[PDB]
Amino acid sequence: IKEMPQPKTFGELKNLPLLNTDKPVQALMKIADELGEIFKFEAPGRVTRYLSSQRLIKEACDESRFDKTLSQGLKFLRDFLGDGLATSWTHEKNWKKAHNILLPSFSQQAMKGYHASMVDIAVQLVQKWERLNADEHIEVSEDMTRLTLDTIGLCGFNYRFNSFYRDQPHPFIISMVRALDEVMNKLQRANPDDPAYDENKRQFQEDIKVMNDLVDKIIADRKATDDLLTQMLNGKDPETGEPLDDGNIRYQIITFLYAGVEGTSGLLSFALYFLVKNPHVLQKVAEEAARVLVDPVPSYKQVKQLKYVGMVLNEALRLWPVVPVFSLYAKEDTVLGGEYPLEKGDEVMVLIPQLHRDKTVWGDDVEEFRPERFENPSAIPQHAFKPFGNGQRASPGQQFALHEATLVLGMMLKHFDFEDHTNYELDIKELQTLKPKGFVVKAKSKKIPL
Numbered sequence: 001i002k003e004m005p006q007p008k009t010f011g012e013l014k015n016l017p018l019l020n021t022d023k024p025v026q027a028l029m030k031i032a033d034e035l036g037e038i039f040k041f042e043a044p045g046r047v048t049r050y051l052s053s054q055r056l057i058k059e060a061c062d063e064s065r066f067d068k069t070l071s072q073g074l075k076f077l078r079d080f081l082g083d084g085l086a087t088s089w090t091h092e093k094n095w096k097k098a099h100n101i102l103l104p105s106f107s108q109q110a111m112k113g114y115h116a117s118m119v120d121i122a123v124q125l126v127q128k129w130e131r132l133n134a135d136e137h138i139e140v141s142e143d144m145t146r147l148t149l150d151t152i153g154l155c156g157f158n159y160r161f162n163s164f165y166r167d168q169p170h171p172f173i174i175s176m177v178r179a180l181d182e183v184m185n186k187l188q189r190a191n192p193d194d195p196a197y198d199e200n201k202r203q204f205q206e207d208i209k210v211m212n213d214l215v216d217k218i219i220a221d222r223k224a225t226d227d228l229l230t231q232m233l234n235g236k237d238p239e240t241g242e243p244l245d246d247g248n249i250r251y252q253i254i255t256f257l258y259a260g261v262e263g264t265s266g267l268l269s270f271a272l273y274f275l276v277k278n279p280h281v282l283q284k285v286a287e288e289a290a291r292v293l294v295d296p297v298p299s300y301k302q303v304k305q306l307k308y309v310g311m312v313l314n315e316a317l318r319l320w321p322v323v324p325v326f327s328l329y330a331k332e333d334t335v336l337g338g339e340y341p342l343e344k345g346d347e348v349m350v351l352i353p354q355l356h357r358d359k360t361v362w363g364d365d366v367e368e369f370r371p372e373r374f375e376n377p378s379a380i381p382q383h384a385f386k387p388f389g390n391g392q393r394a395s396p397g398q399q400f401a402l403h404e405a406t407l408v409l410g411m412m413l414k415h416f417d418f419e420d421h422t423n424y425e426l427d428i429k430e431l432q433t434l435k436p437k438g439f440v441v442k443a444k445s446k447k448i449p450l
């Protein structure tokens with residue numbers, strides 16, 4: 001039975017000032033590197049424990065001992081995501097119902113139905129890059145976000161955001177990013193009732209209205225005229241026979257569009273970054289892309305044969321898991337690793353970037369980008385790789401995300417050579433999800449028609 005380490009406290013503010021940064025997850029990684037596999041973190045009125053080792057995280061991932069909790073971050077996201085799937089307690093009224101109703105929208109049959117829409121948007125991206133002049137460059141994170149929002153819009157809702165017909169981000173992206181930024185600010189605010197924050201609160205309500213205005217256009221357009229929206233509006237819970245309430249449906253739509261703005265866009269941006277920084281890996285992916293993608297547009301079967309592209313995407317998720325933390329609570333009194341006693345309700349945070357750098361399960365070379373790590377998935381120890389979370393509360397979008405990401409990276413490397421023309425230094429923007437900031441490249445067309 002050991003005493004848990006804790007970083008510097010600041011009187012009544014406890015540890016809160018340590019995360020007074022634009023990069024709090026990166027700050028928590030530095031604390032983990034100082035204090036080791038577990039440390040206590042206190043803020044006014046709340047305590048959590050950050051886990052960094054596979055040894056402790058494997059116990060946290062035991063669903064008989066631990067269930068999902070909402071971090072302060074996820075609690076604030078309920079301001080516009082409500083009790084959608086991601087921001088619901090496991091035993092809250094709409095979690096199990098929504099989970100059951102939306103399950104067949106991620107079926108193998110659903111995935112085959114989505115492929116044609118993913119190709120539509122991927123073709124738009126390739127055509128944009130083909131039409132750039134010699135003196136121009138690509139804003140990588142920006143164009144990856146255009147693609148992922150358009151893909152979930154078309155695949156999920158038969159709605160065209162038409163992000164490639166806009167120089168600035170779609171108003172929905174502008175408002176969602178501004179809302180996510182306000183939540184990052186709220187996590188650092190000790191005195192939220194201060195009148196100095198009245199303008200912030202007004203702007204927050206305005207951004208929530210813009211997002212709700214778009215949800216109205218998606219529903220109106222469906223009324224005017226078989227996908228995720230069909231299942232939301234018409235699907236009934238097989239257990240109870242009850243459909244989703246109109247209010248919950250709206251929260252689910254914004255939740256799935258949030259997957260469109262953050263997550264897959266981060267992965268694709270991180271993936272291209274690692275490729276331009278590791279030219280031998282880029283050459284290998286370019287060779288696979290050329291060999292497998294023999295048709296003008298990729299088939300479902302051809303995307304499944306892009307094996308090394310899959311390994312590249314997994315190695316991007318290892319180093320920079322784009323959803324970097326998930327939170328759990330002790331269902332009963334328990335002892336973590338035979339050293340740390342927890343009371344019922346005690347909260348733990350899985351620091352995924354630190355888990356993915358645990359030398360005891362990954363070896364010495366944890367900082368090296370080596371997709372060859374994932375040549376044999378079965379050789380990776382249990383609970384050593386958790387970019388999609390854990391158990392019944394794990395990502396339902398894993399297959400969707402990796403299919404989209406494989407298709408896009410495959411086509412990109414089939415159609416273009418890439419130059420890191422500015423010698424870009426990785427700068428990671430944090431919104432409770434991770435994405436490169438200011439990442440720019442030049443593309444050279446291989447002149448292969450679509």
Ligand code: HEM
Nearest residue numbers: 085086259263264267323326387388389393394395397401
């Ligand atoms: C690289 C891409 C993605 C990553 C890394 C990712 C990661 C995650 C993680 C870690 C969680 C668990 C969060 C927690 O325990 O608090 C999660 C939940 C979820 N993800 Fe994903 N995700 C990705 C793509 C997607 C996509 C494309 C969709 C939808 C189309 C999606 C929908 C969801 C939903 C609805 C949940 C909540 C599930 C529930 O609790 O019932 N994700 N995701």
